[PDB]
Enzyme design. Structure first.
Site, mmCIF file in Angstrom:
data_model
loop_
_atom_site.group_PDB
_atom_site.id
_atom_site.type_symbol
_atom_site.label_atom_id
_atom_site.label_comp_id
_atom_site.label_asym_id
_atom_site.label_seq_id
_atom_site.Cartn_x
_atom_site.Cartn_y
_atom_site.Cartn_z
ATOM 1 N N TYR A 76 0.848 -1.203 0.000
ATOM 2 C CA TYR A 76 0.000 0.000 0.000
ATOM 3 C C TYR A 76 0.876 1.243 0.000
ATOM 4 O O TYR A 76 1.854 1.308 0.741
ATOM 5 C CB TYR A 76 -0.915 -0.018 1.258
ATOM 6 C CG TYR A 76 -2.065 0.974 1.307
ATOM 7 C CD1 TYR A 76 -3.298 0.678 0.712
ATOM 8 C CD2 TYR A 76 -1.945 2.194 1.987
ATOM 9 C CE1 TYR A 76 -4.378 1.586 0.767
ATOM 10 C CE2 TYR A 76 -3.024 3.115 2.052
ATOM 11 C CZ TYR A 76 -4.226 2.801 1.435
ATOM 12 O OH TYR A 76 -5.292 3.678 1.492
ATOM 13 N N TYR A 119 -8.897 4.045 -2.811
ATOM 14 C CA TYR A 119 -9.327 4.449 -4.149
ATOM 15 C C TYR A 119 -10.532 5.372 -4.121
ATOM 16 O O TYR A 119 -10.522 6.399 -4.806
ATOM 17 C CB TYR A 119 -9.650 3.239 -5.045
ATOM 18 C CG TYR A 119 -8.444 2.509 -5.591
ATOM 19 C CD1 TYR A 119 -7.333 3.214 -6.096
ATOM 20 C CD2 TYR A 119 -8.420 1.109 -5.650
ATOM 21 C CE1 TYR A 119 -6.208 2.539 -6.602
ATOM 22 C CE2 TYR A 119 -7.294 0.432 -6.158
ATOM 23 C CZ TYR A 119 -6.193 1.155 -6.626
ATOM 24 O OH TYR A 119 -5.092 0.494 -7.151
ATOM 25 N N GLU A 173 -0.355 -2.270 -7.551
ATOM 26 C CA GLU A 173 -1.187 -3.298 -8.181
ATOM 27 C C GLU A 173 -0.385 -4.187 -9.145
ATOM 28 O O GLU A 173 -0.664 -5.395 -9.251
ATOM 29 C CB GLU A 173 -2.394 -2.700 -8.902
ATOM 30 C CG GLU A 173 -3.258 -1.815 -8.046
ATOM 31 C CD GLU A 173 -4.092 -2.558 -7.022
ATOM 32 O OE1 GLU A 173 -3.828 -3.747 -6.709
ATOM 33 O OE2 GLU A 173 -5.041 -1.925 -6.522
ATOM 34 N N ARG A 176 1.328 -6.609 -7.177
ATOM 35 C CA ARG A 176 0.372 -7.558 -6.594
ATOM 36 C C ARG A 176 -0.027 -8.655 -7.561
ATOM 37 O O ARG A 176 -0.231 -9.793 -7.147
ATOM 38 C CB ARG A 176 -0.896 -6.839 -6.114
ATOM 39 C CG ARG A 176 -0.770 -6.190 -4.745
ATOM 40 C CD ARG A 176 -2.012 -5.394 -4.432
ATOM 41 N NE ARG A 176 -1.910 -4.627 -3.193
ATOM 42 C CZ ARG A 176 -2.097 -3.306 -3.103
ATOM 43 N NH1 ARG A 176 -2.415 -2.584 -4.178
ATOM 44 N NH2 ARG A 176 -1.983 -2.700 -1.927
HETATM 45 N N1 EJ5 Z 1 -2.942 4.374 -1.464
HETATM 46 C C1 EJ5 Z 1 -3.394 3.179 -1.863
HETATM 47 N N2 EJ5 Z 1 -2.512 2.213 -2.080
HETATM 48 C C2 EJ5 Z 1 -2.913 0.998 -2.478
HETATM 49 O O1 EJ5 Z 1 -1.886 0.148 -2.667
HETATM 50 C C3 EJ5 Z 1 -4.267 0.625 -2.701
HETATM 51 C C4 EJ5 Z 1 -4.651 -0.804 -3.182
HETATM 52 C C5 EJ5 Z 1 -6.146 -1.211 -3.348
HETATM 53 C C6 EJ5 Z 1 -6.408 -2.609 -2.745
HETATM 54 C C7 EJ5 Z 1 -6.471 -2.536 -1.202
HETATM 55 C C8 EJ5 Z 1 -6.838 -3.641 -0.440
HETATM 56 C C9 EJ5 Z 1 -6.888 -3.542 0.961
HETATM 57 C C10 EJ5 Z 1 -6.569 -2.335 1.611
HETATM 58 C C11 EJ5 Z 1 -6.616 -2.172 3.154
HETATM 59 O O2 EJ5 Z 1 -7.713 -2.392 3.731
HETATM 60 O O3 EJ5 Z 1 -5.562 -1.811 3.745
HETATM 61 C C12 EJ5 Z 1 -6.202 -1.236 0.841
HETATM 62 C C13 EJ5 Z 1 -6.165 -1.341 -0.544
HETATM 63 C C14 EJ5 Z 1 -5.208 1.634 -2.483
HETATM 64 O O4 EJ5 Z 1 -6.425 1.448 -2.642
HETATM 65 N N3 EJ5 Z 1 -4.769 2.896 -2.068
#
Ligand code: EJ5
Length: 257
Positions: A76, A119, A173, A176
């Protein structure tokens, strides 16, 4: 210091991008924890702070550079550095708020946004859904430039949200999912700019859900099917880990093996 990986949009290629995403994966996890052949990122719970982040250093042909910080437990993007200013998304909890204090500790200016970096928040700020925001080297080169100029007042907040959305998909992503890595490689290869189609979006949305089902699988068989989406928007069911091996590269830690 935290591990640094570098990428530049100046003369970027399929290979230089591939090498980049490989390096990022290699730092995100040691890869000693593998269920059903899929590497698991390290657990949040026992993880010390000197090992919790990696820095991704993005530069342009314009010769300006910006450093993203990735949370190792989930790839993240939690914040970033440009010059003498550093910016963080609103953390989810005090544990995280605490963690991020060890990041970019030498910058003269530190800010935490009022908004988190999910997002949906970012989309509302950008004024555009992911499906309407182009990805590719052009967009990434633009994203890096926008982030660089934020601190001097030259980047509006929507454009900053748009740029974050681009970086997150082309870096976190793509790390991932080999699938999303391959999507970016195609755009680099053909020098094309395009929004991600519903197969990309739905994979992004269901990464957490897919991590759980894989780790809770019975020798690879999901306890119940996961609907994903094809390029053209139609829904199909995945029942087993095997179909996903060439598609998902990393999983958030969900529990013990
Ligand atoms: N800033 C940011 N970085 C990311 O790498 C994502 C990835 C989207 C998938 C995701 C999946 C789970 C979480 C969580 O609950 O911590 C967050 C995002 C995102 O949604 N926002």
């Amino acid at each position: 210091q935290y591990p640094i990986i570098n990428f530049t949009t100046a003369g970027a290629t399929v290979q230089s991008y591939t090498n980049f995403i490989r390096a990022v994966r290699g730092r995100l996890t040691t890869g000693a924890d593998v269920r059903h052949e899929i590497p698991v990122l390290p657990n949040r719970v026992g993880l010390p702070i000197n090992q919790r982040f990696i820095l991704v250093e993005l530069s342009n042909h314009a010769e300006l550079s910006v450093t993203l910080a990735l949370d190792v437990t989930n790839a993240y993007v939690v914040g970033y550095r440009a010059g003498n200013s550093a910016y963080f998304f609103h953390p989810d909890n005090q544990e995280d708020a605490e963690a991020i204090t060890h990041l970019f500790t030498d910058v003269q200016n530190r800010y935490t946004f009022a908004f988190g970096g999910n997002y949906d928040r970012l989309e509302q700020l950008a004024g555009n859904l992911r499906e309407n925001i182009e990805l590719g080297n052009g967009p990434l080169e633009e994203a890096i430039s926008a982030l660089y100029y934020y601190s001097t007042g030259g980047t509006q907040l929507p454009t900053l949200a748009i740029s974050f959305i681009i970086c997150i998909q082309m870096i976190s992503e793509a790390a991932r999912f080999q699938y999303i890595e391959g999507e970016m490689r195609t755009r680099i290869r053909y020098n094309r700019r395009s929004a991600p189609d519903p197969s990309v979006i739905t994979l992004e949305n269901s990464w957490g859900r897919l991590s759980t089902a894989i780790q809770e699988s019975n020798q690879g068989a999901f306890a119940s099917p996961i609907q994903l989406q094809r390029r053209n928007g139609s829904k199909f069911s995945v029942y087993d880990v095997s179909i996903l091996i060439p598609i998902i590269a990393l999983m958030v830690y969900r529990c013990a093996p």
